[PDB]
């Protein structure tokens, strides 16, 4: 009957939960869900695909990577039950009673945010989002306390695999949950910076790193601070760092784009390909091999699971589109009679490749969130295009019907209905092709009435003079409706979108920073097209009680800090003004009782 306080009270007074919980009563708890609730529908669907079948629902919701193998530890089962039924207070209590608190809070946030998109009732989804925010905040606060206590133990707790959540680490759970507040925590960012700089000191200046990159002999001076075989060790320490690999790949990709533009603009003749074009082919082949390597590593797990994880990333989708278009263009080019088609396909492919440069911007705090802003402004443009199309259809068809151009065919009609009014939004207003007061009047038609000759090549040879004032009035109305009103509607949408992301830019950038550091932590140290050496090395490499003690010690440390955190919260609550006033009222009641008894 959802009485969290009595649940807390009865357990605290000696009710052995380990003996109490049985599969019968555990199944009976799920029977208490409302008939119209989301969890009831999910359970019925799972059964249609009697045990509760909660594990199937967890697999459907969270996926194989993060879903607990329910049943799990009664506290974990009770927490899962409370989360599925959206019992906020009982879920909080079950979290504070159990272990694995940071990973459990992250997993709870993930589950609640997954189920929040699946509910038809808006305020129920709002409740789930609010509870997910609360659990994320609890995890952030607990990890902050743990990190302030001990950096090494906190780092070990952050990177350990939790059996309760599909052996996912805290960072993977936060990534799935889109918990940007967890990535923005100082301990997480410090650990990520330490991973990013590898064996170099994170305090190394950027200018020193660039100077050492372009002048390798400077590595062995005191310019770079590191935290014969000794020479090789320092060489591999500098060149193996994720930040150095990132810089090398930036240089490599800029050179690849320069070579692509050079070939496209100079060397791409109908004759068979030359040396530079073959070099471009080999470079693209190594890029495809790198994408294959990333796919085979998931970006033990089944091959399809790794491939789905790889395909879930939008940058990998952009890479696949670019490489597929490159392959199509090259195939068309090598075929007789398809040279021009290959040219155009590769021209669009260059645009696809160049916009991929935006991923580099996420290394910078200023440039990072602007990419998200642009991505959302694109959806704003998509929605604005409906109004633009309606107004263009109305105005263009009316103007074309009034002018009655004699050179009428489907491409010309489309050009004068859509293309010509569209350019008026950007200041291209051909008055001499629409206003008969600026044309010469000639008998260039056989129909009755007066006609005029526009000078434009695509304006029609002869237009009607009848009611041309109405054409001019339509132009006047168009310049007000489209150039100002609709454009500024789109701009207001842009401003709203910009403000939404600018409010939380640091969270966005720190999530992006985690993604970038994770991406370049596992990439080969050689940049393309030399990356073929690393791929060949990998191919040859392939083709030819204490742990649980440390786990228990770490979990005990974490639970002790959770207890300190909860005690601090309770002590802060006790000293609030509302609780002081309540206790004052109660003690005045006691004083009244004393006065009554004294007479």
């Amino acid at each position: 009957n959802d009485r969290p306080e009595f649940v807390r009270l009865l357990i605290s007074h000696g009710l052995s939960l380990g003996h109490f919980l049985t599969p019968m009563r555990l199944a009976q708890l799920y029977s208490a869900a409302p008939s119209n609730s989301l969890i009831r529908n999910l359970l019925d669907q799972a059964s249609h695909s009697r045990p509760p079948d909660v594990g199937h629902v967890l697999r459907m919701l969270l996926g194989k990577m993060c879903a607990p193998r329910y049943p799990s530890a009664p506290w974990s089962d009770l927490l899962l039950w409370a989360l599925l039924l959206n019992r906020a207070q009982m879920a909080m209590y079950f979290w504070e009673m159990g272990s694995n608190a940071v990973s459990s809070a992250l997993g709870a946030c993930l589950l609640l945010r997954v189920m929040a998109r699946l509910e038809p009732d808006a305020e129920e989804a709002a409740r789930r989002k609010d509870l997910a925010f609360k659990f994320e905040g609890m995890g952030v606060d607990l990890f902050g306390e743990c990190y302030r206590s001990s950096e090494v133990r906190a780092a070990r707790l952050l990177l350990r695999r939790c059996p309760l959540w599909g052996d996912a680490t805290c960072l993977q759970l936060a990534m799935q949950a889109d918990a940007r507040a967890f990535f923005a925590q100082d301990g997480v960012q410090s650990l990520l910076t330490q991973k990013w700089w590898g064996d170099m000191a994170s305090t190394t200046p950027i200018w020193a790193l660039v100077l050492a990159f372009f002048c390798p002999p400077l590595i062995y001076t005191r310019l770079i601070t590191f935290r014969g075989r000794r020479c090789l060790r320092r060489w591999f320490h500098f060149w193996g760092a994720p930040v150095t690999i990132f810089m090398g790949n930036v240089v490599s990709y800029l050179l690849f784009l320069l070579l692509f533009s050079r070939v496209l603009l100079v060397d791409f003749q109908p004759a068979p390909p030359g040396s530079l074009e073959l070099l471009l082919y080999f470079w693209a082949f190594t890029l495809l091999c790198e994408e294959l390597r990333q796919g085979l590593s998931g970006g033990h797990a089944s091959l399809s699971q790794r491939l789905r994880l790889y395909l879930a990333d939008s940058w990998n989708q952009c890479d696949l589109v670019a490489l597929t278009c490159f392959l199509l263009g090259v195939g068309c080019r090598l075929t007789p009679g398809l040279y021009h088609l290959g040219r155009t396909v590769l021209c669009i492919d260059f645009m696809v490749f160049t916009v991929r440069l935006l991923h580099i911007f996420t290394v910078n705090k200023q440039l990072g969130p602007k990419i998200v802003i642009v991505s959302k402004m694109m959806k704003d443009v998509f929605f604005f295009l409906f109004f633009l199309g309606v107004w263009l259809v109305a105005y263009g068809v009316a103007t074309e019907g009034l002018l009655r151009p004699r050179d009428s065919d489907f491409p010309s009609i489309l050009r004068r209905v859509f293309y010509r009014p569209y350019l008026q939004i950007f200041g291209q207003i051909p008055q001499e092709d629409m206003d008969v007061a600026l044309m010469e009047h000639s008998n260039c038609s056989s129909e009755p009435g007066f006609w005029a000759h526009p000078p434009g090549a695509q304006a029609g040879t002869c237009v009607s003079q009848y009611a041309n004032w109405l054409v001019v009035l339509l132009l006047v109305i168009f310049l007000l409706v489209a150039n100002i009103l609709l454009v500024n509607l789109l701009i207001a949408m842009f401003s709203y979108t910009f403000g939404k992301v600018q409010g939380n830019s640091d969270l966005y950038w720190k999530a992006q920073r985690y993604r970038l550091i994770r991406e370049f932590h596992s990439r080969p140290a050689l940049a393309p097209p030399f990356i073929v050496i690393s791929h060949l090395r990998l191919l040859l490499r392939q083709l030819c009680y204490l742990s649980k003690e440390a786990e228990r010690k770490l979990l005990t440390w974490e639970s002790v800090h959770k207890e300190n955190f909860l005690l601090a919260r309770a002590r802060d609550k006790r000293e609030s003004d509302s609780e002081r006033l309540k206790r004052t009222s109660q003690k005045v009641d006691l004083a009244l009782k004393q006065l009554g008894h004294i007479r």
Binding site: S149, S150, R153, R552, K553, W557, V560
Partner: protein
């Protein structure tokens, strides 16, 4: 296991001999090996054990006559700071009333856990129908003897405090201050160090620094350095 520095808390066990299970191995006049998984066995989380031999093999309760004296001697001991000693009573049978009386005649502060029943609740409810109460917490008890014992205990309320779940450090400080009595400023250094460690500002400012107690610089230098660090 959760501590990040050096060890500071030690658990000491005082137990009667003959009750220790598998004690046969301990007889070697040296690191002994103890098969505790086989009377009650010793708890492996403790760092030292005192096995008081009552002579009566298997008898329970014979270790009080040494435990109380050890507590008193530690209470009277100096490091040169006095070492405060406190007793915590979770619950008890009729024998815990005798234990509390003996620990009160030889001054030792005591804490009574409220809501845990037994002798703890029996002593707590009279602090803050007397025969009815004694029967309520001791259904089989001898009402007259228990009443006399409870009155003898309540003669000296200054050594008793009630701890309620509705914190620990504040109650400990209050109990330690309540039984001090003297005013030479040497008997309050221990309480001052405890207040510094537990951040009990109001307790120190109210109880410890009053015009009765004649402090001066050398008393407070160490506490000032502790508060600075």
């Amino acid at each position: 296991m959760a501590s990040t520095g050096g060890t500071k808390v030690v658990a000491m066990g005082v137990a009667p001999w003959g009750v220790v299970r598998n004690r046969d191995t301990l007889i070697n006049p040296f690191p002994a090996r103890y098969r505790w998984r086989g009377q009650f066995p010793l708890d492996y989380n403790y760092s030292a054990f005192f096995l008081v031999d009552d002579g009566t093999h298997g008898c329970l309760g014979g270790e009080n006559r040494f435990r109380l004296r050890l507590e008193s001697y530690i209470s009277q001991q100096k490091t040169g700071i006095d070492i405060p000693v406190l007793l915590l009573l979770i619950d008890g049978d009729e024998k815990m009333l005798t234990r509390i009386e003996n620990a009160t005649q030889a001054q030792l502060p005591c804490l009574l856990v409220a809501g845990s029943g037994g002798a703890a609740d029996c002593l707590a409810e009279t602090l803050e129908e007397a025969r009815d109460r004694i029967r309520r917490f001791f259904p089989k008890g001898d009402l007259e003897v228990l009443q006399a014992q409870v009155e003898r205990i309540m003669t000296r309320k200054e050594l008793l405090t009630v701890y309620s779940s509705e914190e620990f450090e504040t109650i400990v400080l209050k109990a330690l201050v309540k039984a001090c009595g003297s005013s030479e400023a040497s008997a309050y250094l221990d309480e001052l160090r405890l207040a510094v460690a537990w951040n009990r500002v109001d307790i120190a400012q109210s109880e410890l620094f009053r015009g009765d107690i004649q402090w001066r610089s050398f008393h407070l230098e160490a506490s000032l350095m502790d508060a600075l660090l």
